[PDB]
Design a protein around this motif. Structure first.
Motif, mmCIF file in Angstrom:
data_model
loop_
_atom_site.group_PDB
_atom_site.id
_atom_site.type_symbol
_atom_site.label_atom_id
_atom_site.label_comp_id
_atom_site.label_asym_id
_atom_site.label_seq_id
_atom_site.Cartn_x
_atom_site.Cartn_y
_atom_site.Cartn_z
ATOM 1 N N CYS A 13 -1.083 -7.551 6.892
ATOM 2 C CA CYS A 13 -2.010 -7.712 5.780
ATOM 3 C C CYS A 13 -2.264 -6.401 5.053
ATOM 4 C CB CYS A 13 -3.289 -8.410 6.222
ATOM 5 S SG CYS A 13 -2.967 -10.155 6.652
ATOM 6 N N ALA A 15 -5.120 -4.906 3.535
ATOM 7 C CA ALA A 15 -6.450 -4.352 3.307
ATOM 8 C C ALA A 15 -6.381 -2.908 3.818
ATOM 9 C CB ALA A 15 -7.496 -5.140 4.095
ATOM 10 N N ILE A 17 -8.838 -1.193 5.908
ATOM 11 C CA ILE A 17 -10.038 -1.213 6.737
ATOM 12 C C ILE A 17 -9.929 -0.155 7.822
ATOM 13 C CG2 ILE A 17 -11.404 -2.600 8.366
ATOM 14 C CD1 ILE A 17 -10.202 -5.087 6.764
ATOM 15 N N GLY A 35 -4.847 -3.444 8.524
ATOM 16 C CA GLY A 35 -4.550 -4.281 7.375
ATOM 17 C C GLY A 35 -5.411 -5.512 7.176
ATOM 18 N N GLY A 36 -6.204 -5.874 8.181
ATOM 19 C CA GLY A 36 -7.071 -7.031 8.041
ATOM 20 C C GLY A 36 -6.702 -8.263 8.841
ATOM 21 N N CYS A 37 -5.481 -8.312 9.364
ATOM 22 C CA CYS A 37 -5.082 -9.470 10.151
ATOM 23 C C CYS A 37 -4.136 -9.161 11.292
ATOM 24 C CB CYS A 37 -4.440 -10.538 9.254
ATOM 25 S SG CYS A 37 -2.764 -10.115 8.662
ATOM 26 N N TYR B 22 -16.808 2.260 1.683
ATOM 27 C CA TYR B 22 -15.551 2.797 1.166
ATOM 28 C C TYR B 22 -14.751 1.593 0.654
ATOM 29 C CZ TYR B 22 -13.733 0.936 5.558
ATOM 30 O OH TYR B 22 -13.430 0.072 6.587
ATOM 31 N N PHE B 24 -12.015 -1.108 0.570
ATOM 32 C CA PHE B 24 -11.170 -1.708 1.602
ATOM 33 C C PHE B 24 -10.306 -2.879 1.113
ATOM 34 C CE2 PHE B 24 -14.889 -4.389 1.736
ATOM 35 C CZ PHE B 24 -14.395 -5.649 2.061
ATOM 36 N N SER B 177 -4.957 -5.656 -0.954
ATOM 37 C CA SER B 177 -5.326 -7.024 -0.551
ATOM 38 C C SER B 177 -6.504 -7.604 -1.307
ATOM 39 C CB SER B 177 -5.633 -7.100 0.938
ATOM 40 O OG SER B 177 -4.460 -7.326 1.689
ATOM 41 N N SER B 192 -1.775 -10.540 -0.436
ATOM 42 C CA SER B 192 -2.006 -10.994 0.928
ATOM 43 C C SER B 192 -1.338 -10.199 2.051
ATOM 44 C CB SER B 192 -1.657 -12.494 1.029
ATOM 45 O OG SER B 192 -1.945 -13.033 2.302
ATOM 46 N N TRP B 193 -0.011 -10.274 2.164
ATOM 47 C CA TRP B 193 0.673 -9.565 3.247
ATOM 48 C C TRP B 193 2.146 -9.307 2.960
ATOM 49 C CZ3 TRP B 193 4.708 -11.946 6.098
ATOM 50 C CH2 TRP B 193 4.891 -13.321 5.858
#
Ligand SMILES: [Ca+2]
Ligand SMILES: [Ca+2]
Ligand code: NA
Lengths: 57, 223
Positions: A13, A15, A17, A35-37, B22, B24, B177, B192-193
């Protein structure tokens, strides 16, 4: 296998984070980009959670 | 965004930044009170930042509004990533003008080959790390479902689509994302990914917004 000794996993993913992982080589919980996942277990929301779970690994 | 270009201050008025102390994730403003983002971008205490260009400096056109609601699609699967969409309600209505504006939802799905605009404040390097201050943009085509499935065997659902260049070098990346993929003035996708970023034979995967239009409208109206 100790999950605390696994390299940090960003995942597929996209993101950005900030999470914590236990760095066995340095002997401390460090920050990394998640990445979020599909997180692995050496991924914590705080330094405290990381130290409690992986401290001294 | 890897292999892109500097959009220019507020040239993508519907692009928002999701902040939790921050930046994200990104998001797309669809009306004065609602933002579309990715389900995997669900986080605590989200603050939506609109009218942003330089994400690290106050330039005067910003609007910081907290999320009052964060509705993840009820069928979101955190393993397969199916239904990777989330709706965020703004605690107070955003002030719309030229610098802050909503993006229209699609009336129909986009065909393969359609050129789109992908944007975000994500990593600009395929190998390494470099996060930009200002918003980055990238023009990329929608790819066929067949090519997408060949690139990611057993991973592409009916709610996902690939976009980019198979030779590598141009793609969305970590920090992008939830952001927009706009084609012909319509929000067709959500970042998404993918397997890394800008890798050869590994185009970015995006949530197919055209499959959720009715759900988006009804959900917003019922909250
Ligand atoms: Ca560190
Ligand atoms: Ca700013
Ligand atoms: Na600027």
């Amino acid at each position: 296998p100790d999950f605390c000794l696994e390299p940090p996993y960003t995942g597929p993913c996209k993101a950005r984070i900030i999470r914590y992982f236990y760095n066995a080589k340095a002997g401390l919980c460090q920050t990394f980009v998640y990445g979020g996942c599909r997180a692995k277990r050496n991924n914590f929301k705080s330094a405290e959670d990381c130290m409690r779970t992986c401290g001294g690994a | 965004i890897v292999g892109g270009y500097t959009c220019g201050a507020n040239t993508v008025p519907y692009q928002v930044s999701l902040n939790s102390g921050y930046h994200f994730c990104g998001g797309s403003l669809i009306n004065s009170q609602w933002v579309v983002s990715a389900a995997h971008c669900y986080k605590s205490g989200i603050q939506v930042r609109l009218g942003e260009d330089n994400i690290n400096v106050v330039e005067g056109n910003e609007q910081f509004i907290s999320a009052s609601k964060s509705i993840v699609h009820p069928s979101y699967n955190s393993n397969t990533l199916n239904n990777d969409i989330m709706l965020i309600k703004l605690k107070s209505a955003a002030s719309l003008x030229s610098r802050v504006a909503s993006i229209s939802l699609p009336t129909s799905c986009a065909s393969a080959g359609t050129q789109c605009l992908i944007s975000g404040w994500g990593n600009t390097k395929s190998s390494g790390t470099s996060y930009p201050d200002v918003l980055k943009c990238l023009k990329a085509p929608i790819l066929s479902d067949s090519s997408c499935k060949s690139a990611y065997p057993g991973q592409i659902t009916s709610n996902m689509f690939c976009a980019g260049y198979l030779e590598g070098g141009k793609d969305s990346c970590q920090g992008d994302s939830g952001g927009p993929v706009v084609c012909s003035g319509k929000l067709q996708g959500i970042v998404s990914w993918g397997s890394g970023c800008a890798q050869k034979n590994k185009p970015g995967v995006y949530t197919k917004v055209c499959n959720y239009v009715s759900w988006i409208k009804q959900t917003i109206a019922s909250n």
